[PDB]
Design a binder for this molecule. Structure first.
Ligand SMILES: [Mg+2]
Ligand SMILES: [Mg+2]
Ligand code: NI
Length: 78
């Protein structure tokens, strides 16, 4: 069966919170309040879904995030 996927960013001990907010705006076109909210969700919960779409589209988002130095994975949405 067909299924959509999500990209998840994970908290890490090195990166700056301000960097993550910028990366989400730059890579995804998100507004500042959206990017900051997602950043704080990852930082306070340990992880958060940052984007959603086809498996192929999430593969691109994971690669973009890895090149930025962020810990990203993808998984099917259930
Ligand atoms: Mg990270
Ligand atoms: Mg879900
Ligand atoms: Ni921290």
């Amino acid at each position: 069966t067909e299924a959509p996927w999500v990209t998840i960013v994970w908290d890490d001990p090195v990166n700056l919170m301000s960097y993550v907010t910028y990366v989400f705006q730059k890579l995804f076109g998100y507004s500042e309040p959206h990017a900051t909210k997602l950043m704080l969700q990852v930082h306070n919960e340990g992880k958060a879904v940052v984007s959603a779409g086809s498996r192929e589209s999430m593969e691109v988002d994971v690669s973009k995030l890895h090149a930025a130095g962020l810990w990203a994975t993808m998984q099917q949405d259930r």
